[PDB]
Amino acid sequence: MDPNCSCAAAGDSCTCANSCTCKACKCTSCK
Ligand SMILES: [Cd+2]
Ligand SMILES: [Cd+2]
Ligand SMILES: [Cd+2]
């Protein structure tokens, strides 16, 4: 369930290099 952003999990491999989805991503790959 991706509400606004389900990244910054530390360890896991988020996919913010292809196409971001989070509505409120805070990853350095999408500011
Ligand atoms: Cd990410
Ligand atoms: Cd992102
Ligand atoms: Cd995110």
Side-chain angles (χ1 to χ4, degrees):
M1 306 128 74
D2 177 89
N4 302 327
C5 157
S6 342
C7 298
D12 317 58
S13 314
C14 77
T15 46
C16 287
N18 320 265
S19 257
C20 184
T21 56
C22 324
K23 189 111 116 103
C25 193
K26 170 162 62 30
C27 269
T28 66
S29 281
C30 338
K31 66 241 257 63

PDB file of all heavy atoms in Angstrom:
ATOM      1  N   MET A   1       0.823  -1.197   0.000  1.00  0.00           N
ATOM      2  CA  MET A   1       0.000   0.000   0.000  1.00  0.00           C
ATOM      3  C   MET A   1       0.867   1.261   0.000  1.00  0.00           C
ATOM      4  O   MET A   1       1.400   1.651   1.038  1.00  0.00           O
ATOM      5  CB  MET A   1      -0.902   0.000   1.236  1.00  0.00           C
ATOM      6  CG  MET A   1      -1.703  -1.300   1.329  1.00  0.00           C
ATOM      7  SD  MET A   1      -1.503  -2.026   2.948  1.00  0.00           S
ATOM      8  CE  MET A   1      -2.529  -0.926   3.910  1.00  0.00           C
ATOM      9  N   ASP A   2       0.980   1.863  -1.174  1.00  0.00           N
ATOM     10  CA  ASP A   2       1.773   3.072  -1.322  1.00  0.00           C
ATOM     11  C   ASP A   2       0.857   4.293  -1.220  1.00  0.00           C
ATOM     12  O   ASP A   2       0.196   4.661  -2.191  1.00  0.00           O
ATOM     13  CB  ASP A   2       2.465   3.113  -2.686  1.00  0.00           C
ATOM     14  CG  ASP A   2       3.270   4.384  -2.964  1.00  0.00           C
ATOM     15  OD1 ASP A   2       4.463   4.468  -2.635  1.00  0.00           O
ATOM     16  OD2 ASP A   2       2.616   5.326  -3.554  1.00  0.00           O
ATOM     17  N   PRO A   3       0.845   4.902  -0.005  1.00  0.00           N
ATOM     18  CA  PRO A   3       0.021   6.074   0.237  1.00  0.00           C
ATOM     19  C   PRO A   3       0.629   7.316  -0.419  1.00  0.00           C
ATOM     20  O   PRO A   3       0.099   7.822  -1.407  1.00  0.00           O
ATOM     21  CB  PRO A   3      -0.069   6.186   1.750  1.00  0.00           C
ATOM     22  CG  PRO A   3       1.080   5.356   2.299  1.00  0.00           C
ATOM     23  CD  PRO A   3       1.614   4.494   1.167  1.00  0.00           C
ATOM     24  N   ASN A   4       1.731   7.772   0.158  1.00  0.00           N
ATOM     25  CA  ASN A   4       2.415   8.945  -0.358  1.00  0.00           C
ATOM     26  C   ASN A   4       3.826   8.553  -0.803  1.00  0.00           C
ATOM     27  O   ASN A   4       4.313   9.030  -1.827  1.00  0.00           O
ATOM     28  CB  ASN A   4       2.543  10.026   0.717  1.00  0.00           C
ATOM     29  CG  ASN A   4       1.168  10.427   1.257  1.00  0.00           C
ATOM     30  OD1 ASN A   4       0.173  10.431   0.553  1.00  0.00           O
ATOM     31  ND2 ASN A   4       1.170  10.763   2.544  1.00  0.00           N
ATOM     32  N   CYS A   5       4.442   7.686  -0.012  1.00  0.00           N
ATOM     33  CA  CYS A   5       5.786   7.225  -0.311  1.00  0.00           C
ATOM     34  C   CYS A   5       6.119   6.068   0.633  1.00  0.00           C
ATOM     35  O   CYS A   5       6.043   6.216   1.852  1.00  0.00           O
ATOM     36  CB  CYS A   5       6.809   8.358  -0.209  1.00  0.00           C
ATOM     37  SG  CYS A   5       8.532   7.811   0.081  1.00  0.00           S
ATOM     38  N   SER A   6       6.479   4.942   0.035  1.00  0.00           N
ATOM     39  CA  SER A   6       6.823   3.761   0.808  1.00  0.00           C
ATOM     40  C   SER A   6       8.272   3.358   0.530  1.00  0.00           C
ATOM     41  O   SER A   6       8.564   2.183   0.312  1.00  0.00           O
ATOM     42  CB  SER A   6       5.879   2.600   0.488  1.00  0.00           C
ATOM     43  OG  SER A   6       4.676   3.045  -0.132  1.00  0.00           O
ATOM     44  N   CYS A   7       9.145   4.356   0.549  1.00  0.00           N
ATOM     45  CA  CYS A   7      10.557   4.120   0.302  1.00  0.00           C
ATOM     46  C   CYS A   7      11.301   4.221   1.635  1.00  0.00           C
ATOM     47  O   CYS A   7      10.724   3.970   2.692  1.00  0.00           O
ATOM     48  CB  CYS A   7      11.118   5.090  -0.740  1.00  0.00           C
ATOM     49  SG  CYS A   7      10.352   4.963  -2.397  1.00  0.00           S
ATOM     50  N   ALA A   8      12.570   4.591   1.541  1.00  0.00           N
ATOM     51  CA  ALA A   8      13.399   4.729   2.726  1.00  0.00           C
ATOM     52  C   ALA A   8      13.125   3.559   3.674  1.00  0.00           C
ATOM     53  O   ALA A   8      12.742   3.765   4.825  1.00  0.00           O
ATOM     54  CB  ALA A   8      13.130   6.086   3.382  1.00  0.00           C
ATOM     55  N   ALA A   9      13.331   2.359   3.154  1.00  0.00           N
ATOM     56  CA  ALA A   9      13.111   1.156   3.939  1.00  0.00           C
ATOM     57  C   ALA A   9      14.453   0.643   4.467  1.00  0.00           C
ATOM     58  O   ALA A   9      14.493  -0.163   5.395  1.00  0.00           O
ATOM     59  CB  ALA A   9      12.384   0.114   3.086  1.00  0.00           C
ATOM     60  N   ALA A  10      15.520   1.132   3.850  1.00  0.00           N
ATOM     61  CA  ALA A  10      16.860   0.733   4.246  1.00  0.00           C
ATOM     62  C   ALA A  10      17.016  -0.776   4.053  1.00  0.00           C
ATOM     63  O   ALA A  10      16.470  -1.564   4.823  1.00  0.00           O
ATOM     64  CB  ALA A  10      17.116   1.166   5.691  1.00  0.00           C
ATOM     65  N   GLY A  11      17.765  -1.135   3.020  1.00  0.00           N
ATOM     66  CA  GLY A  11      18.001  -2.536   2.717  1.00  0.00           C
ATOM     67  C   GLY A  11      17.264  -2.952   1.442  1.00  0.00           C
ATOM     68  O   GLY A  11      17.854  -3.559   0.550  1.00  0.00           O
ATOM     69  N   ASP A  12      15.985  -2.608   1.397  1.00  0.00           N
ATOM     70  CA  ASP A  12      15.161  -2.937   0.247  1.00  0.00           C
ATOM     71  C   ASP A  12      15.628  -2.121  -0.960  1.00  0.00           C
ATOM     72  O   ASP A  12      16.379  -1.160  -0.810  1.00  0.00           O
ATOM     73  CB  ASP A  12      13.692  -2.600   0.507  1.00  0.00           C
ATOM     74  CG  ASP A  12      13.173  -2.992   1.892  1.00  0.00           C
ATOM     75  OD1 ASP A  12      13.810  -2.465   2.882  1.00  0.00           O
ATOM     76  OD2 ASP A  12      12.210  -3.762   2.019  1.00  0.00           O
ATOM     77  N   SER A  13      15.162  -2.535  -2.130  1.00  0.00           N
ATOM     78  CA  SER A  13      15.521  -1.854  -3.361  1.00  0.00           C
ATOM     79  C   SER A  13      14.293  -1.163  -3.955  1.00  0.00           C
ATOM     80  O   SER A  13      13.496  -1.795  -4.648  1.00  0.00           O
ATOM     81  CB  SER A  13      16.125  -2.829  -4.375  1.00  0.00           C
ATOM     82  OG  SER A  13      17.096  -3.685  -3.779  1.00  0.00           O
ATOM     83  N   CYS A  14      14.178   0.125  -3.664  1.00  0.00           N
ATOM     84  CA  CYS A  14      13.059   0.908  -4.161  1.00  0.00           C
ATOM     85  C   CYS A  14      13.274   1.157  -5.655  1.00  0.00           C
ATOM     86  O   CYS A  14      14.407   1.144  -6.134  1.00  0.00           O
ATOM     87  CB  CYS A  14      12.893   2.213  -3.383  1.00  0.00           C
ATOM     88  SG  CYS A  14      14.090   3.526  -3.821  1.00  0.00           S
ATOM     89  N   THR A  15      12.168   1.378  -6.351  1.00  0.00           N
ATOM     90  CA  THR A  15      12.222   1.630  -7.780  1.00  0.00           C
ATOM     91  C   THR A  15      11.808   3.072  -8.083  1.00  0.00           C
ATOM     92  O   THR A  15      10.644   3.338  -8.379  1.00  0.00           O
ATOM     93  CB  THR A  15      11.345   0.587  -8.478  1.00  0.00           C
ATOM     94  OG1 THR A  15      10.145   0.574  -7.710  1.00  0.00           O
ATOM     95  CG2 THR A  15      11.897  -0.832  -8.332  1.00  0.00           C
ATOM     96  N   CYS A  16      12.784   3.964  -7.999  1.00  0.00           N
ATOM     97  CA  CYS A  16      12.536   5.371  -8.261  1.00  0.00           C
ATOM     98  C   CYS A  16      13.496   5.832  -9.360  1.00  0.00           C
ATOM     99  O   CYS A  16      13.866   7.004  -9.414  1.00  0.00           O
ATOM    100  CB  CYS A  16      12.673   6.215  -6.992  1.00  0.00           C
ATOM    101  SG  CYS A  16      11.303   6.027  -5.794  1.00  0.00           S
ATOM    102  N   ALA A  17      13.872   4.887 -10.208  1.00  0.00           N
ATOM    103  CA  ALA A  17      14.781   5.181 -11.302  1.00  0.00           C
ATOM    104  C   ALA A  17      14.034   5.054 -12.631  1.00  0.00           C
ATOM    105  O   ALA A  17      14.427   5.654 -13.629  1.00  0.00           O
ATOM    106  CB  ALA A  17      15.993   4.250 -11.224  1.00  0.00           C
ATOM    107  N   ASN A  18      12.967   4.268 -12.600  1.00  0.00           N
ATOM    108  CA  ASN A  18      12.160   4.055 -13.789  1.00  0.00           C
ATOM    109  C   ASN A  18      11.018   5.071 -13.813  1.00  0.00           C
ATOM    110  O   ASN A  18      10.987   5.955 -14.670  1.00  0.00           O
ATOM    111  CB  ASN A  18      11.546   2.653 -13.793  1.00  0.00           C
ATOM    112  CG  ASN A  18      12.546   1.614 -13.285  1.00  0.00           C
ATOM    113  OD1 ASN A  18      13.249   0.968 -14.045  1.00  0.00           O
ATOM    114  ND2 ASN A  18      12.572   1.490 -11.961  1.00  0.00           N
ATOM    115  N   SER A  19      10.105   4.914 -12.866  1.00  0.00           N
ATOM    116  CA  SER A  19       8.964   5.808 -12.768  1.00  0.00           C
ATOM    117  C   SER A  19       8.440   5.831 -11.331  1.00  0.00           C
ATOM    118  O   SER A  19       7.934   4.826 -10.834  1.00  0.00           O
ATOM    119  CB  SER A  19       7.853   5.389 -13.732  1.00  0.00           C
ATOM    120  OG  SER A  19       7.801   6.227 -14.884  1.00  0.00           O
ATOM    121  N   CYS A  20       8.577   6.990 -10.703  1.00  0.00           N
ATOM    122  CA  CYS A  20       8.123   7.158  -9.334  1.00  0.00           C
ATOM    123  C   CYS A  20       6.596   7.049  -9.317  1.00  0.00           C
ATOM    124  O   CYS A  20       5.938   7.349 -10.312  1.00  0.00           O
ATOM    125  CB  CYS A  20       8.607   8.479  -8.735  1.00  0.00           C
ATOM    126  SG  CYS A  20       8.172   8.730  -6.975  1.00  0.00           S
ATOM    127  N   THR A  21       6.077   6.620  -8.175  1.00  0.00           N
ATOM    128  CA  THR A  21       4.642   6.468  -8.016  1.00  0.00           C
ATOM    129  C   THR A  21       4.163   7.207  -6.765  1.00  0.00           C
ATOM    130  O   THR A  21       3.102   7.830  -6.775  1.00  0.00           O
ATOM    131  CB  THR A  21       4.324   4.972  -7.996  1.00  0.00           C
ATOM    132  OG1 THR A  21       5.130   4.459  -6.939  1.00  0.00           O
ATOM    133  CG2 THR A  21       4.838   4.248  -9.243  1.00  0.00           C
ATOM    134  N   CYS A  22       4.968   7.115  -5.717  1.00  0.00           N
ATOM    135  CA  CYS A  22       4.641   7.768  -4.461  1.00  0.00           C
ATOM    136  C   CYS A  22       4.127   9.175  -4.770  1.00  0.00           C
ATOM    137  O   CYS A  22       4.657   9.853  -5.649  1.00  0.00           O
ATOM    138  CB  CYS A  22       5.837   7.792  -3.507  1.00  0.00           C
ATOM    139  SG  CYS A  22       6.896   6.301  -3.564  1.00  0.00           S
ATOM    140  N   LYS A  23       3.102   9.572  -4.029  1.00  0.00           N
ATOM    141  CA  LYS A  23       2.512  10.887  -4.214  1.00  0.00           C
ATOM    142  C   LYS A  23       3.286  11.910  -3.381  1.00  0.00           C
ATOM    143  O   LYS A  23       3.171  13.115  -3.606  1.00  0.00           O
ATOM    144  CB  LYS A  23       1.014  10.849  -3.904  1.00  0.00           C
ATOM    145  CG  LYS A  23       0.339  12.162  -4.305  1.00  0.00           C
ATOM    146  CD  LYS A  23      -0.592  11.958  -5.502  1.00  0.00           C
ATOM    147  CE  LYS A  23      -2.048  12.233  -5.118  1.00  0.00           C
ATOM    148  NZ  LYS A  23      -2.478  13.554  -5.628  1.00  0.00           N
ATOM    149  N   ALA A  24       4.058  11.394  -2.436  1.00  0.00           N
ATOM    150  CA  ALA A  24       4.852  12.248  -1.568  1.00  0.00           C
ATOM    151  C   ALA A  24       6.198  11.577  -1.292  1.00  0.00           C
ATOM    152  O   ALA A  24       6.541  11.316  -0.140  1.00  0.00           O
ATOM    153  CB  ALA A  24       4.071  12.539  -0.285  1.00  0.00           C
ATOM    154  N   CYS A  25       6.925  11.317  -2.368  1.00  0.00           N
ATOM    155  CA  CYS A  25       8.228  10.681  -2.256  1.00  0.00           C
ATOM    156  C   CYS A  25       9.201  11.686  -1.639  1.00  0.00           C
ATOM    157  O   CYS A  25       9.083  12.889  -1.865  1.00  0.00           O
ATOM    158  CB  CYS A  25       8.722  10.163  -3.609  1.00  0.00           C
ATOM    159  SG  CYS A  25      10.162   9.036  -3.518  1.00  0.00           S
ATOM    160  N   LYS A  26      10.142  11.156  -0.871  1.00  0.00           N
ATOM    161  CA  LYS A  26      11.136  11.991  -0.220  1.00  0.00           C
ATOM    162  C   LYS A  26      12.533  11.455  -0.537  1.00  0.00           C
ATOM    163  O   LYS A  26      13.509  11.837   0.108  1.00  0.00           O
ATOM    164  CB  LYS A  26      10.845  12.102   1.279  1.00  0.00           C
ATOM    165  CG  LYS A  26      12.009  12.766   2.016  1.00  0.00           C
ATOM    166  CD  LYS A  26      11.570  13.269   3.392  1.00  0.00           C
ATOM    167  CE  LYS A  26      11.102  12.111   4.275  1.00  0.00           C
ATOM    168  NZ  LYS A  26      11.825  10.868   3.927  1.00  0.00           N
ATOM    169  N   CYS A  27      12.586  10.579  -1.528  1.00  0.00           N
ATOM    170  CA  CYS A  27      13.848   9.986  -1.939  1.00  0.00           C
ATOM    171  C   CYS A  27      14.675  11.061  -2.647  1.00  0.00           C
ATOM    172  O   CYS A  27      14.122  11.955  -3.285  1.00  0.00           O
ATOM    173  CB  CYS A  27      13.634   8.756  -2.822  1.00  0.00           C
ATOM    174  SG  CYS A  27      13.543   7.168  -1.918  1.00  0.00           S
ATOM    175  N   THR A  28      15.987  10.938  -2.510  1.00  0.00           N
ATOM    176  CA  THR A  28      16.896  11.888  -3.130  1.00  0.00           C
ATOM    177  C   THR A  28      16.864  11.741  -4.652  1.00  0.00           C
ATOM    178  O   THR A  28      17.461  12.543  -5.369  1.00  0.00           O
ATOM    179  CB  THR A  28      18.287  11.673  -2.527  1.00  0.00           C
ATOM    180  OG1 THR A  28      18.663  10.374  -2.978  1.00  0.00           O
ATOM    181  CG2 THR A  28      18.250  11.542  -1.003  1.00  0.00           C
ATOM    182  N   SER A  29      16.162  10.711  -5.101  1.00  0.00           N
ATOM    183  CA  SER A  29      16.045  10.450  -6.525  1.00  0.00           C
ATOM    184  C   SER A  29      14.821  11.172  -7.091  1.00  0.00           C
ATOM    185  O   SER A  29      14.624  11.210  -8.305  1.00  0.00           O
ATOM    186  CB  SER A  29      15.951   8.948  -6.804  1.00  0.00           C
ATOM    187  OG  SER A  29      17.227   8.316  -6.753  1.00  0.00           O
ATOM    188  N   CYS A  30      14.030  11.728  -6.184  1.00  0.00           N
ATOM    189  CA  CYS A  30      12.831  12.447  -6.578  1.00  0.00           C
ATOM    190  C   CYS A  30      12.473  13.432  -5.463  1.00  0.00           C
ATOM    191  O   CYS A  30      11.768  13.078  -4.521  1.00  0.00           O
ATOM    192  CB  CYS A  30      11.676  11.493  -6.889  1.00  0.00           C
ATOM    193  SG  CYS A  30      12.183   9.788  -7.320  1.00  0.00           S
ATOM    194  N   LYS A  31      12.978  14.649  -5.607  1.00  0.00           N
ATOM    195  CA  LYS A  31      12.721  15.687  -4.624  1.00  0.00           C
ATOM    196  C   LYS A  31      11.774  16.729  -5.224  1.00  0.00           C
ATOM    197  O   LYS A  31      10.870  17.168  -4.480  1.00  0.00           O
ATOM    198  CB  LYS A  31      14.036  16.275  -4.110  1.00  0.00           C
ATOM    199  CG  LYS A  31      14.779  17.014  -5.225  1.00  0.00           C
ATOM    200  CD  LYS A  31      16.147  16.381  -5.486  1.00  0.00           C
ATOM    201  CE  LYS A  31      17.267  17.217  -4.864  1.00  0.00           C
ATOM    202  NZ  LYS A  31      17.125  17.260  -3.391  1.00  0.00           N
TER     203      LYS A  31
HETATM  204 CD    CD B   1      12.640   5.597  -3.690  1.00  0.00          CD
HETATM  205 CD    CD B   2      10.486   8.487  -5.972  1.00  0.00          CD
HETATM  206 CD    CD B   3       8.949   7.074  -2.300  1.00  0.00          CD
END
